[PDB]
Design a protein around this ligand. Structure first.
Ligand SMILES: NC(=O)c1ccc[n+]([C@@H]2O[C@H](COP(=O)([O-])OP(=O)(O)OC[C@H]3O[C@@H](n4cnc5c(N)ncnc54)[C@H](OP(=O)(O)O)[C@@H]3O)[C@@H](O)[C@H]2O)c1
Ligand SMILES: NC(=O)c1ccc[n+]([C@@H]2O[C@H](COP(=O)([O-])OP(=O)(O)OC[C@H]3O[C@@H](n4cnc5c(N)ncnc54)[C@H](OP(=O)(O)O)[C@@H]3O)[C@@H](O)[C@H]2O)c1
Ligand SMILES: Nc1nc2c(c(=O)[nH]1)N[C@@H](CNc1ccc(C(=O)N[C@@H](CCC(=O)O)C(=O)O)cc1)CN2
Ligand SMILES: Nc1nc2c(c(=O)[nH]1)N[C@@H](CNc1ccc(C(=O)N[C@@H](CCC(=O)O)C(=O)O)cc1)CN2
Ligand SMILES: O=c1ccn([C@H]2C[C@H](O)[C@@H](COP(=O)(O)O)O2)c(=O)[nH]1
Ligand SMILES: O=c1ccn([C@H]2C[C@H](O)[C@@H](COP(=O)(O)O)O2)c(=O)[nH]1
Lengths: 494, 495
């Protein structure tokens, strides 16, 4: 219909996943050389086989993948060939899938694939819809030529984690920080075990490490939470205490499918996405969200809360002309939720989408919910209250201004919410997703969240996950939470 | 008038200047000792302390400099030169009254004043309405005990420049070193240092000059961004006009203890800043009110041809429609023409925030905006500084501005000064002291043609900011005028 935003033909193009991300698992000697420790084989099997979910039996619907060179495949004892419970992807210029099957002594057909190519070719195959998102983690298991390719671009930028066992008994060398070979990645240890002793009868000495690429973007957030606790002003309102500072700014890359969902505490993505779509549709009835099991508006849509605003005539969960209402119908007269507001008010989102397509250098491509005429008719004044877009080199960037920032729960939710908005607007306009800039006004931690924030500040952030689209829609307003999926999200535990 | 904002009777309090700023002039030996016969150094001293900065006009009681000196330095000045001529002479003494100093002369009663106290007491005097703004620069000329007071808090935070002459020829002049406790957070750096010079004194004495200034990290933030836009911004051309740009940035400026962040590496048109800001706060929309004060910044956007190009064929010339201040004091009101009676129409966001600040300063919704999509097409030009939010802590008011399009050459310094002035005014309206300005930038750009003079500006090391004082006050916020306030100690570099 005429009021919706039609997606262009290029809709899938700038979000298509080029290479699937992966982790590396390697054992080396004390000099880093890669040429019988059962505890290491126990760790290898568990780390490469188990899914992150509670009690999930690996199957073609949901399992890990192991990627290896043809010589590593040859050297697996035939008892464990193919590695059971994993997809086995084997790199070879010589051997087809059929030849690998012919080397066994039909059970295994869905679990073995040959790739005539290197690790990059294997990551390109694993990014296709038959394997993403069904493969949960891709593990690269060598050998030396495959590790070399994993540790240089373009593959190295998709390496989430390196699991290295060192055993006191061609070198595996992680690029050093600041060096050309590192390509701007700063490798750091998340964990390193004590020196351990094998029960193998030889008293073999070994230790494990897990390295991860330093995530300076989530570090920004961490630094700000640490500063608010160490130096923020205490205020009490009802008497709820907060610690606060005023004025800050963070930036996050959305390029090549990255999604900045924080890793040091899990973000409720399903909630982020349902809510953002609800904003984009211009919705105002919060029951639409609570009926999908997203309860973030229940406190502010209650009879009691609405009455406390003077909104006595609103039905329960009708929030008035909040948010998406102003995005799609700024200044329209509001009566009740779900009336026909087609063509009323200013549709700021449609207008920006049209400008992005025809004049992407325009400096007025902004939208707002802060409408002081409508403020008193809203359950709450918007907190994320405007955003502005910018284009460079065919990439779309967005800056968000947020007046009141709960660092514990609101801010990580809003980062994700605006990352997703930017990605969707780039898909609507022929552009690739660029950077998200988040400006913060009053940035606060509730005083009862101080000890848990301190516990969270103990954690070293991990690589962010990625966003892919399983399918597309003819109109921007018809997107659904099931159309897209977050892959490679590995947050720390609660 | 019921629609205006009445100033509280604390209006003058949070803005009264406590101590007047000053600069220091000293001669030392190669060891830093202060104990000479170098006529070029006397000439320097005489010219620096006597001359005014604009027109080289005769100093008089309406406009001159001051010299501040301890009693023994006064005793040491040769009677041909006592008191110094063309300067107000301020003498620190627990023992000598002004009359006792007059008695020790062999016309001068308005040019000599004794202060029973130290440098801090002299700077409090010099801050009073009889001496600020009429004294253009205050110079501290020693001796040891007065220099030691100049170089520690509280006086050192008011020290704008140290002019040291060193001469190859007891007590030591030592400027606190960077990062030390004695430095109190200030980083002294050389703006200039001469080559080694030889005196025409009969002895070929060797000497040289330095001028030291307190590093101004706030203005450096701006210059760093200008440098980054030129070295790394994206080139774009619009009608063919070129810019270099980046997206998303943020700067912060202290407004504390009368400081005013008017940039020093290129002079800002303060009078135009002030006139326009007051014009916004009154809710005005006629640009002729400004061009009739010689502030022409809206002339291009208010022309007949320009209005016609936006479709605004029924608006008389210079009527901008419901821009800026009109949304600040009348958000959402229907606009007909400039100067109609809009009282009580639309939302008065400035009034509302003033009442919230007085009663619930912790509120997190004290924001105003001019970005009104319904009214955008009636405006001559959508606002560029479009919203601001206030925050209070420790009795201090801070403000953050959001600006969508940021011309770093001319616009940005102008709007830093604009929102610094707004914040100071709103603090005076609400019983608060001015705190900090936070400036958030969207599309931040340098026009292609300004690259070379921006690069000439980046050669300059920023100097300490000036200060804002209020000569008088008003009953209503809307009645303030540019002549009610004065910028003092502004010493920008040349064009
Ligand atoms: N400590 C450890 O964790 C560790 C690590 C690595 C290796 N190892 C040991 O070393 C041995 C593995 O040897 P390796 O490291 O020499 O070899 P590998 O890397 O496992 O296998 C190399 C083979 O992989 C295929 N391959 C690699 N890149 C390719 C590309 N771009 N295109 C097509 N095919 C490609 C080629 O097979 P085709 O010849 O069929 O084309 C190549 O000969 C094993 O016996 C193992 O025990 C141990
Ligand atoms: N090369 C140079 O630049 C340079 C620099 C400094 C000095 N000098 C020379 O060194 C001599 C200066 O002597 P100095 O440095 O020992 O003296 P000074 O600082 O010039 O004078 C000290 C006198 O100032 C008054 N004073 C200072 N602080 C005071 C306070 N808090 N309250 C009240 N009164 C205060 C007192 O006068 P009462 O005794 O009347 O109470 C005190 O005795 C002169 O001969 C001068 O020409 C040269
Ligand atoms: N960290 C770790 N990483 C590694 C190796 C290691 O040595 N340890 N060695 C290389 C991989 N080589 C093999 C060899 C044999 C098997 C194998 O056969 N594994 C069975 C378990 C067999 C068993 O329990 O002994 C499995 O089910 O995973 C797996 C990888 C590269 N990466
Ligand atoms: N840099 C510089 N700074 C200084 C001194 C200096 O030594 N040079 N010396 C101390 C000031 N002492 C004096 C002593 C005498 C005079 C004096 O008499 N000046 C006449 C000019 C005299 C002349 O031209 O011969 C005048 O009108 O300024 C000025 C400062 C502290 N500051
Ligand atoms: O998207 C949002 C909305 C709200 N908040 C937080 C900010 C405040 O701590 C609180 C709302 O209180 P006020 O700012 O409205 O008073 O919720 C967020 O973090 N994110
Ligand atoms: O307060 C203001 C108003 C305007 N501009 C500059 C920004 C742009 O260079 C130009 C406005 O052009 P658009 O952004 O509206 O296209 O003027 C400023 O820097 N500050």
């Amino acid at each position: 219909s005429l009021f919706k935003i039609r997606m262009p033909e290029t809709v899938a193009e700038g979000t298509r996943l080029a290479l699937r991300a992966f982790s590396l698992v390697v054992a080396v000697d004390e000099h880093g050389g890669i040429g019988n420790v059962p505890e290491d084989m126990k760790f290898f099997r568990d780390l490469t086989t188990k899914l992150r979910g509670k009690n999930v039996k690996p199957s073609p619907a949901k399992r890990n993948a192991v990627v290896m060179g043809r010589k590593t495949w040859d050297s697996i004892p035939p008892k464990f060939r193919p590695l059971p419970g994993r997809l086995n992807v084997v790199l070879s210029s010589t051997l087809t899938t059929q030849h690998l099957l012919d080397g066994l002594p039909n059970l295994h057909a869905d679990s073995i694939v040959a790739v005539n190519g290197g690790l990059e070719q294997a990551l390109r195959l694993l990014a296709s819809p038959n394997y993403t998102p069904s493969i949960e983690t891709v593990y690269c298991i060598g050998g030396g030529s495959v590790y070399a390719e994993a540790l240089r671009p373009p593959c190295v930028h998709l390496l989430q984690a390196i699991y290295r066992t060192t055993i006191r008994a061609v070198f595996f060398r992680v690029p050093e920080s600041g060096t050309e070979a590192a390509a701007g990645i700063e490798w750091q240890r998340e964990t390193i075990s004590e020196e351990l002793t094998s029960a193998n009868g030889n008293e073999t000495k070994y230790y494990f490490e897990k390295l991860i690429p330093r995530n300076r973007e989530e570090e920004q957030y961490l630094s700000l939470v640490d500063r608010i606790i160490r130096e923020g002003n205490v205020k009490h309102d009802t008497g709820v205490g907060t610690l606060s500072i005023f004025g800050a700014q963070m930036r996050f890359s959305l390029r090549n499918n990255r999604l900045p969902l924080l890793t040091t505490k899990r973000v409720f993505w399903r909630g982020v996405c349902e809510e953002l779509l609800w904003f984009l549709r211009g919705e105002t009835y919060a029951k639409k969200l609570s009926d999908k099991g997203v309860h973030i508006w229940d406190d502010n849509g209650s009879r009691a809360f609405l009455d406390s605003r003077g909104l006595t005539e609103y039905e329960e969960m009708d929030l008035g002309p909040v948010y998406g209402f102003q995005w799609r119908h700024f200044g329209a007269a509001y009566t009740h939720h779900d009336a026909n507001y087609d063509g009323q008010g200013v549709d700021q989102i449609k207008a920006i989408v049209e400008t992005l397509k025809t004049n992407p250098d325009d400096r007025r491509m902004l939208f707002t919910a802060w409408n002081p005429s409508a403020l008193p008719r809203m359950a709450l004044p918007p907190c994320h209250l405007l955003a502005q877009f910018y284009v460079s080199n065919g990439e779309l960037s967005c800056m968000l201004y947020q007046r009141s920032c709960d660092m514990g729960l609101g801010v990580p939710f809003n980062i994700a919410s605006y990352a997703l908005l930017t990605i969707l607007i780039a898909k609507a306009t022929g552009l690739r997703p660029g950077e998200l800039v988040h400006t913060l006004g009053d940035a606060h931690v509730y005083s009862n969240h101080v000890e848990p924030c301190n516990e969270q500040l103990k954690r070293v952030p991990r690589a962010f996950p990625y966003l892919v689209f399983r399918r597309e829609r003819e109109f921007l307003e018809d997107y659904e939470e099931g159309d897209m999926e977050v892959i490679d999200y590995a947050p720390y535990p609660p």
